[PDB]
Amino acid sequence: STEEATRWADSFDVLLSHKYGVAAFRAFLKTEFSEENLEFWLACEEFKKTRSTAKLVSKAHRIFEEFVDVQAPREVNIDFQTREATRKNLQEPSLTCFDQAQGKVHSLMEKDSYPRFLRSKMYLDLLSQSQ
Amino acid sequence: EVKLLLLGAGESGKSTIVKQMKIIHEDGYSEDECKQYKVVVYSNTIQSIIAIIRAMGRLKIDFGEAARADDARQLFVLAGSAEEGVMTPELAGVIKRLWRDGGVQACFSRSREYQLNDSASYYLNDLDRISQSNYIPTQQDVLRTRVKTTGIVETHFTFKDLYFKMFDVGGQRSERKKWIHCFEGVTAIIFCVALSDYDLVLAEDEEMNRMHESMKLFDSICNNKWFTETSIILFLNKKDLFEEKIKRSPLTICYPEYTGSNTYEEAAAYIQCQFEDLNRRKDTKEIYTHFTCATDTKNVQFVFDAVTDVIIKNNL
Numbered sequence: 013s014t015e016e017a018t019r020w021a022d023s024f025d026v027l028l029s030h031k032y033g034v035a036a037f038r039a040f041l042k043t044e045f046s047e048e049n050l051e052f053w054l055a056c057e058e059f060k061k062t063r064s065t066a067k068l069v070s071k072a073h074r075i076f077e078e079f080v081d082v083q084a085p086r087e088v089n090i091d092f093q094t095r096e097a098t099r100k101n102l103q104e105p106s107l108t109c110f111d112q113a114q115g116k117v118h119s120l121m122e123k124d125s126y127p128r129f130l131r132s133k134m135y136l137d138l139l140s141q142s143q
Numbered sequence: 144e145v146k147l148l149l150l151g152a153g154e155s156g157k158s159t160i161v162k163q164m165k166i167i168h169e170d171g172y173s174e175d176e177c178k179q180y181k182v183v184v185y186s187n188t189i190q191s192i193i194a195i196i197r198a199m200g201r202l203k204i205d206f207g208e209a210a211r212a213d214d215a216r217q218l219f220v221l222a223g224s225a226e227e228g229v230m231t232p233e234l235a236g237v238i239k240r241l242w243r244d245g246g247v248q249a250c251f252s253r254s255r256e257y258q259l260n261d262s263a264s265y266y267l268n269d270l271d272r273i274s275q276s277n278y279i280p281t282q283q284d285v286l287r288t289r290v291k292t293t294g295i296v297e298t299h300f301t302f303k304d305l306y307f308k309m310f311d312v313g314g315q316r317s318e319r320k321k322w323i324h325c326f327e328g329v330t331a332i333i334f335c336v337a338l339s340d341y342d343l344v345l346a347e348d349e350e351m352n353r354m355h356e357s358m359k360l361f362d363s364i365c366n367n368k369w370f371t372e373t374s375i376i377l378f379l380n381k382k383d384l385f386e387e388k389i390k391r392s393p394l395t396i397c398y399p400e401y402t403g404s405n406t407y408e409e410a411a412a413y414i415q416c417q418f419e420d421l422n423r424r425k426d427t428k429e430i431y432t433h434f435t436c437a438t439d440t441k442n443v444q445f446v447f448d449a450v451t452d453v454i455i456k457n458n459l
């Protein structure tokens with residue numbers, strides 16, 4: 013448990029590769045009102061696993077409506093260039109439709125939220141309680 | 144207790160004011176903390192030169208020398224090479240040749256026509272220093288870094304026997320639906336405005352003037368019933384960048400009716416007037432305005448001291 017909790021600090025991507033690291037980071041992001049970033053990122057990971065075209069087209073539309081559109085209830089913080097590229101990609105959806113937007117959101121979490129996670133009371137409690 | 148909100152549009156200087164509170168009123172930046180910003184300095188540098196190169200297509204600008212074409216290809220391939228915080232001599236040299244190219248510089252001069260970090264030239268002009276294998280970011284290098292804020296971040300610190308509960312937020316349009324969460328029982332707002340925004344467009348809407356956006360947002364905040372009793376402090380920030388820019392880009396871009404001079408004192412004064420005019424309860428409520436350079440510790444310390452005095456005086 014302590015080796016796993018300490019592994020989350022090795023890099024953001026190592027944190028993301030652990031189910032319990034993802035869950036902890038989610039709880040942390042809720043306290044900072046930025047959990048849409050993680051839920052968008054996870055949605056994109058799931059999208060890339062899709063095996064049928066009808067399923068792919070529907071999920072691309074749902075992800076866009078939920079997270080990417082300017083009126084989206086959980087609109088992610090991405091620039092116009094990134095949002096527009098995504099919009100254009102949605103006309104003929106493929107598995108790389110969200111790559112640009114997902115990369116931007118990954119960078120946003122990695123550089124902003126994740127360093128604060130590693131210094132948080134929440135993470136420090138998890139460490140001290142581990143094992 | 145003082146609940147203090149740092150508000151303003153994207154890139155206005157909010158988190159930089161937050162860095163200054165750590166420097167002045169909390170624990171400061173240790174060398175180890177500085178070292179943690181190295182990969183950010185590198186990323187900001189690499190992303191900035193990439194942005195200028197990319198824009199050269201939109202802008203119909205050629206390289207001063209043909210040999211830079213291969214440097215540009217090399218830059219794009221290498222762009223990931225420094226994510227572990229090592230700028231290779233190869234990458235360093237590629238960037239140096241591109242930044243010194245006359246086409247690249249012509250594009251840099253026209254950066255209002257695209258999206259470029261304010262600290263781009265700061266870092267690019269210091270490439271020799273920052274590219275050394277032993278490089279440790281200085282405190283000013285840290286202050287100059289660009290990391291976009293998402294969500295709402297609370298910190299605390301003490302000053303003049305007051306306990307400050309400080310809230311830093313994201314400034315982009317997408318973020319602003321979250322701000323209401325922190326609007327209860329607010330003692331003071333520092334509302335940041337990038338003076339140097341007057342000729343830029345929003346990263347999230349490239350057909351919106353950034354200062355016009357800031358005005359709309361200040362209108363909204365200043366007159367919000369949540370803040371009737373809140374001390375409203377206006378930081379007309381990036382005064383240093385504004386001083387330089389005003390000598391080459393006319394204020395009429397933002398305010399077509401302006402008939403004053405394109406000088407720091409007159410143009411700055413006019414912007415102050417435009418923001419202060421948005422107060423629809425002038426008989427009832429003050430705006431406490433300061434011209435700031437958020438990256439200048441001495442300046443922010445002086446201004447924040449003055450601000451604290453206003454808050455004490457307003458809570459007697």
Ligand SMILES: Nc1nc2c(ncn2[C@@H]2O[C@H](COP(=O)(O)OP(=O)(O)O)[C@@H](O)[C@H]2O)c(=O)[nH]1
Binds near residue numbers: 155156261
């Ligand atoms: N030269 C200069 N740079 C500034 C000033 N204020 C902020 N910056 C820089 O502008 C960028 C955006 O600032 P930031 O605090 O991240 O904006 P925020 O989005 O409002 O938090 C950063 O790279 C800062 O270093 C200033 O007054 N002068």
Ligand code: ALF
Binds near residue numbers: 312
């Ligand atoms: F653009 Al910001 F904090 F408003 F990074």
Ligand SMILES: [Mg+2]
Binds near residue numbers: 290
């Ligand atoms: Mg910020």
